[PDB]
Design an enzyme around this catalytic site. Structure first.
Site, PDB file in Angstrom:
ATOM      1  N   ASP A  49      12.313  -5.189   2.279  1.00  9.76           N
ATOM      2  CA  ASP A  49      13.311  -4.558   1.399  1.00  9.76           C
ATOM      3  C   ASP A  49      13.593  -3.167   1.706  1.00  9.76           C
ATOM      4  O   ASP A  49      14.167  -2.455   0.858  1.00  9.76           O
ATOM      5  CB  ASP A  49      12.724  -4.843   0.024  1.00  9.76           C
ATOM      6  CG  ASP A  49      13.747  -4.533  -1.136  1.00  9.76           C
ATOM      7  OD1 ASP A  49      14.825  -5.320  -1.066  1.00  9.76           O
ATOM      8  OD2 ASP A  49      13.351  -3.873  -1.726  1.00  9.76           O
ATOM      9  N   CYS A 108       0.792  -1.154  -0.047  1.00 11.56           N
ATOM     10  CA  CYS A 108      -0.088  -0.019   0.056  1.00 11.56           C
ATOM     11  C   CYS A 108       0.872   1.328   0.165  1.00 11.56           C
ATOM     12  O   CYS A 108       2.125   1.285   0.445  1.00 11.56           O
ATOM     13  CB  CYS A 108      -0.841  -0.155   1.163  1.00 11.56           C
ATOM     14  SG  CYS A 108      -0.150  -0.109   2.858  1.00 11.56           S
ATOM     15  N   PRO A 109       0.223   2.110  -0.510  1.00 14.30           N
ATOM     16  CA  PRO A 109       0.876   3.589  -0.356  1.00 14.30           C
ATOM     17  C   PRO A 109       1.211   4.148   1.187  1.00 14.30           C
ATOM     18  O   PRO A 109       0.072   3.874   1.888  1.00 14.30           O
ATOM     19  CB  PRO A 109       0.280   4.514  -1.224  1.00 14.30           C
ATOM     20  CG  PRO A 109      -0.935   3.821  -1.628  1.00 14.30           C
ATOM     21  CD  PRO A 109      -1.003   2.639  -0.929  1.00 14.30           C
ATOM     22  N   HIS A 141      16.852  -2.419  -0.839  1.00 11.40           N
ATOM     23  CA  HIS A 141      15.594  -1.680  -1.740  1.00 11.40           C
ATOM     24  C   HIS A 141      15.922  -1.966  -3.130  1.00 11.40           C
ATOM     25  O   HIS A 141      16.164  -1.123  -4.047  1.00 11.40           O
ATOM     26  CB  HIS A 141      15.708  -0.084  -1.620  1.00 11.40           C
ATOM     27  CG  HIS A 141      14.520   0.498  -1.954  1.00 11.40           C
ATOM     28  ND1 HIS A 141      14.135   1.825  -1.497  1.00 11.40           N
ATOM     29  CD2 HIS A 141      13.574   0.198  -2.632  1.00 11.40           C
ATOM     30  CE1 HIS A 141      13.071   2.362  -1.997  1.00 11.40           C
ATOM     31  NE2 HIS A 141      12.662   1.371  -2.739  1.00 11.40           N
ATOM     32  N   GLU A 173      17.113   4.889   4.955  1.00  7.87           N
ATOM     33  CA  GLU A 173      17.934   4.452   4.075  1.00  7.87           C
ATOM     34  C   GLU A 173      18.993   5.057   3.552  1.00  7.87           C
ATOM     35  O   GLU A 173      18.731   6.068   3.280  1.00  7.87           O
ATOM     36  CB  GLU A 173      17.173   3.739   2.916  1.00  7.87           C
ATOM     37  CG  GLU A 173      15.843   2.659   3.191  1.00  7.87           C
ATOM     38  CD  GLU A 173      15.101   2.497   1.998  1.00  7.87           C
ATOM     39  OE1 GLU A 173      15.568   2.489   0.785  1.00  7.87           O
ATOM     40  OE2 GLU A 173      13.961   2.174   2.127  1.00  7.87           O
ATOM     41  N   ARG A 221       6.954   0.510   1.695  1.00  4.47           N
ATOM     42  CA  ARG A 221       7.218   1.598   2.398  1.00  4.47           C
ATOM     43  C   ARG A 221       7.766   1.376   3.884  1.00  4.47           C
ATOM     44  O   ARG A 221       7.006   1.056   4.605  1.00  4.47           O
ATOM     45  CB  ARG A 221       6.468   3.012   1.899  1.00  4.47           C
TER      46      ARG A 221
END
Lengths: 322, 323
Positions: free
Chosen positions: A261, A208-209, A285, A266, A237
């Site tokens: 991931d 999901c965003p 990522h 980050e 995310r």
């Protein structure tokens, strides 16, 4: 027509081709761009390509020649696309390029948590098979997905792909699908509320965003609602999780494992609690980044540019602001 | 009232499942493993013996005159002289099908680790590679998608068919060498092929056939030479299905981009096994069968076998011809 890629290395580190973009204009590809060099390098460009190089209102106003931005990703969070709009600059993205790349990465993470093939390979190489008192061994319990419930938070393309794979592995599937009432052609499948997903799922995968509504979705309370021995996967995310609560759930045994991931920071700190947690698998990522997906991303980026030239721009993410 | 002995129960239940289904049916003793010189001692007095890999020959069986039933904690029973058991009037049962999903999923655990190398990148993060990286992300190994690749399945029993369904769902084409059965699954693209055609057309080959005279050294230098460069081999079946030398050379040459092996011709391996020096070779210690779910099922099916023997109608008998 003059085209500039500000950080092209991650899309094409020498294993694919810029040819589709080179057919449409004069291309310059920088492998990456530090913040102090953005205006220098973008100056004179009709079209700018960015993956993660930021473009804010101050950079956009310093580039009066700029007529079109294409983002080398589905996400465009580092581009102020509203500011681009008011200056009359359409911004396009690429959805769908990495559906299979990402969905398969969910299962690469999950099956490595379940089987730990690389660990056992390492132990064989240290002589653990000879040292073993039995014909076989395992330093990590081997776990089967069959009969478990896969709970899918967000049911866009990638989520749906995760569900099809899960079904084929003999898992039940449940989806929290707020943006769309999409019914797939397999059973057992069911739509559930978010609360119900966490109480019923043995494996939860996030797709999901990140929004106000979904920030810190995976919190101490939803974790407490889960069955002990559950698995969490996140290729979406970082801020979807409370990283602290997840570390504690891993150490307590609430979560049997986590496959990540992405992270909220980050690159991570050495003392990020998720790097000290047991049964945690982390990748940098790269879920999106199969050679096939990057090839597709290149083609779709050429299509976006071709469409802008033809006067009918496609995949526009700032239509409301133009 | 009935006396049951498990001679090597540790691998079936190393503390994470339950002997309860067996304990309902008699008095159970569970030894974690048994060396050869202790088999008669431990099995003495037992009505029922459970063995996974503890061998039972004619001489051991005749030294256990109390022994009335053997259940094998596996599908294979190669270390049990079941013919000798037969002539002495001892039914021997096995358990087929317990590990279909365990094994099929291990094929994909090996294959996806070769394609994405998740554990490698986890290790590199822990060595500080993400901080050291000049970009927001990185990869030391090209990330490879299974979409549009062809999965070639050598042997199309239950496990093979499971592998095929999974492959299909990952967007792979499937082809099967299916000598024992013309089984048509409900997905496309799918096709039956000869064994040589399988190797020329498959990007990933997975082995799911029994070891016989006909299939010893199936994966040989010639079939390897026929494969497209960059292909993958997976073997969760039997070690002697491969010519280990040819496979090592194919890995070093780049013919095979990778190999995932849960079995070897010598277990445990020597330091000088060529597959331990070969690049892009992933090896796991004969554990494809061993998910907690499969072992749980194996336990229940073993209880069913014993229950049936007590009821006078023994099930899954592998030596009916010698009884």
């Amino acid at each position: 027509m003059r085209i500039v890629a500000l950080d092209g290395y991650t899309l094409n580190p020498g294993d694919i081709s810029w040819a589709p973009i080179e057919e449409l204009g004069e291309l310059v590809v920088h492998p990456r761009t530090p913040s102090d060099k953005i205006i220098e390098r973008a100056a004179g460009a009709h079209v700018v390509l960015t993956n993660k190089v930021p473009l804010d209102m101050s950079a956009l106003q310093a580039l009066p020649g700029l007529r079109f931005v294409s983002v080398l990703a589905t996400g465009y969070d580092k581009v102020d696309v509203a500011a681009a709009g008011v200056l009359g600059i359409p911004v396009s993205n690429v959805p769908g390029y990495g559906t299979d790349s990402v969905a398969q990465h969910v299962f690469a993470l999950l099956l490595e948590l379940c089987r730990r093939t690389a660990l056992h390979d390492h132990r064989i190489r240290a002589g653990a098979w000879t040292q073993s008192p039995d014909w076989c061994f395992w330093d990590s319990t081997q776990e089967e997905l069959t009969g478990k419930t896969m709970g899918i938070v967000g049911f866009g393309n990638t989520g749906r792909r995760v569900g099809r794979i899960a079904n084929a592995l003999g898992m039940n599937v449940i989806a929290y699908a707020p943006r769309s009432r999409f019914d797939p052609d397999y059973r057992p499948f069911e739509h559930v509320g978010l609360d119900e997903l966490f109480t019923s799922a043995d494996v939860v995968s996030l797709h999901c965003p990140l929004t106000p509504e979904t920030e810190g979705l995976v919190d101490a309370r939803r974790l407490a609602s889960m069955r002990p021995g559950s698995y969490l996967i996140n290729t979406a995310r970082g801020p979807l999780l409370d990283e602290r609560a997840v570390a504690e759930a891993l150490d307590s045994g609430r979560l049997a494992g986590a496959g990540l991931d992405v992270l909220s920071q980050e690159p991570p700190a050495a003392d990020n609690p998720l790097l000290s947690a047991k049964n945690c698998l982390i990748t940098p990522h790269l879920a999106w980044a199969s050679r096939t997906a990057r090839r597709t991303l290149m083609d779709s980026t050429a299509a976006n540019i071709r469409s802008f030239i033809e006067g009918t721009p496609v995949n526009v993410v700032n239509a409301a602001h133009l």
